[PDB]
Symmetry: D2
């Protein structure tokens, strides 16, 4: 697939929509404010819309390398503050995936250039849960770090002033930590679901305990 | 659609893949390095995979509010450096969309909170092309700013040290500036396609001239 | 001067304070909240305390390359929000200096590495005021860009949600744009002093007009 | 001291330099590339030039809240890459101070606004060394966290691709971790001095062991 193939496929796909689903854009034209924010990885192995079946206009999406919510990443923070304060999304979903190239690159630690600084945040998590990973077989360490990474980004998101203020105001915002593999595409709930400051700390320790 | 509906739909979708497309994950398991990087908006009105027909594993995706490539956004820069130096993508596509909430919020300029700082970069572009927008009817100003925004992010991307170094090394990397509307989902090529430092400056002025 | 010389000089300087100024730290121990925030360049050719005579504890200081206030630099924005909302500084001073290495590196544009991305914000200003610099002799272009850079960072600071909210609340916060040279160390007021949203836009055009 | 007092003091100070030290700017005009980079706190309780006696032109300075070197702070990283690759500084000094308002605000954790996100990096350190602080008296916990913060920023700086590449190339660059108090202004060497990748990890554990 070259560039010309993508452009030509888009034109043919747009024209065939008149027969298949002429109302494909009606919910978009009606300004359907999305109820979900998806924070995923730039790998995008299986698209979030394909995993969940969410139709166009229902999903706000941010994607960075290894789905991180850094404390001081104004890029991701701006997406969250916009989705929470303006769009008023009711659910935020952070979703990693097993075999993530960013998580793996943080462990193997090769000289990849500028991205290594970004990956240092994963190694902080990989260092933080060193005692937890030791009680586990070696073959399961990398997939668990992928889950631990999601749990920590959920933790970081809930600790941000954006979520602290929204929960203080009383907004119904729920944070979710998910993961999937390319062996079945089955979403796994890491069970760190947070609705307020108390459930955030409660379910974080619950997710760490289940591992 | 609640949270339980997305989880249950994912399970049923994963099981039905055995009959519909049991090889749905074969290209993913074979570690297909993506040839395309998509820098789009977090609005994600129509997903990039739906617009272009790209199958899972073929598209590296970064999404922020109003598809920006800020000079000093290490989030977006890390995605680019990883896609260019490690994954060695052959095409980078920056794609806006008409009626973008971020572009519109920058023009109307309401008090939306933290996101207004992020949107100040659009107002810089909206200020930069003030004389160009004046020669146009009022009803076409906002859609053109959406196109100008894409052209400037392509300009910024090509000016980054990541792209300057890759083009200096001789890597075949091409930057594209696209836009689409939710009235047909038809991708429009803004014709600022850059393959090196010279075509970057050449096609930037060509895109500005066509407007 | 090696490392041992700095450590030994500090010890001797600390001991000699008992005779010279035993109350050197009394204002510091009394928790003197600083009334001034200084946003200067990392070059720090002449220290701000030496230029203004401000004693220890009176100056909050942020320094980056070429004294920038990028719209989305959470580092500088965090210093400002802390100084304005918590410390409640009454004056913010952005001060460049003629012959700044960062301003010069942006114009000459050498391959310096990661810093070139940071310097792209200066080239945006150098592009923005292209018509203004043309009406001037060549020998004065670089020093004027140093002044234009300060005026634009003052403009950016006043446009940030931190300053917009503080001025909306009624806080007495004043932004200043200064510059100095190493030929005399004399501070030059660029006359873009802003106390609210109206004087910000008014004095910005006044500073551009004086050039 | 108002604004007029600072401007007038600067003018009088500049004029009196002709009699006191007419060569005050000679080392500045001779383009003395600084050999030291100082990463300090924006509190700037005692200026670095006053602590060490470094004359103008000898010190490259970056200052943020609680002297942090975040993995993905392109502001601080740009200052470092410029000082190391372009200026080729031979020493980088990270210096905290006891009673730092940022360190204290991270522990007490009040609702201060945007700065709380920046301070979450300190709470990560305060969480990381929880077992170390427990073996110590309560009255010494906060001053030790100030030291631990410096040791971790030195650790982060040495882990950045900027320092990893400079040490790989063979550049003589040394990282130092210092701290001082406003009770005497005496600089304390935290003894985490790093000259390469090996001494970085060695002296980090040595500094943690001394506590
Ligand atoms: K993914
Ligand atoms: K979109
Ligand atoms: K300076
Ligand atoms: K300090
Ligand atoms: Zn991934
Ligand atoms: Zn949009
Ligand atoms: Zn400078
Ligand atoms: Zn401090």
């Amino acid at each position: 697939k070259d560039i010309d193939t993508l452009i030509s496929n888009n034109a043919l796909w747009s024209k065939m929509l008149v027969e298949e689903d002429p109302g494909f854009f009606e919910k978009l034209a009606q300004a359907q404010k999305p109820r979900f924010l998806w924070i995923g990885c730039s790998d995008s192995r299986v698209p979030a819309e394909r995993l969940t079946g969410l139709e166009p206009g229902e999903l706000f999406v941010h994607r960075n390398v290894a789905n991180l919510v850094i404390h001081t990443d104004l890029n991701c923070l701006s997406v969250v503050q916009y989705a929470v304060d303006v769009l008023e999304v009711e659910h935020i979903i952070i979703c990693g995936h097993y075999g993530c190239g960013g998580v793996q690159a943080a462990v193997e630690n090769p000289e990849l250039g500028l991205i290594n600084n970004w990956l240092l945040h994963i190694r902080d998590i990989w260092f933080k849960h060193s005692s937890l990973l030791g009680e586990m077989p070696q073959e399961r360490r990398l997939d668990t770090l992928c889950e631990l990474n999601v749990m920590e980004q959920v933790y970081n998101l809930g600790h941000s002033t954006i979520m602290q203020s929204a929960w203080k105001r009383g907004q119904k915002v729920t944070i979710h930590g998910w993961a999937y593999g390319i062996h079945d595409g089955l979403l796994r709930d890491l069970d760190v679901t947070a609705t307020n400051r108390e459930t955030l700390e409660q379910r974080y320790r619950h997710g760490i305990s289940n591992l």
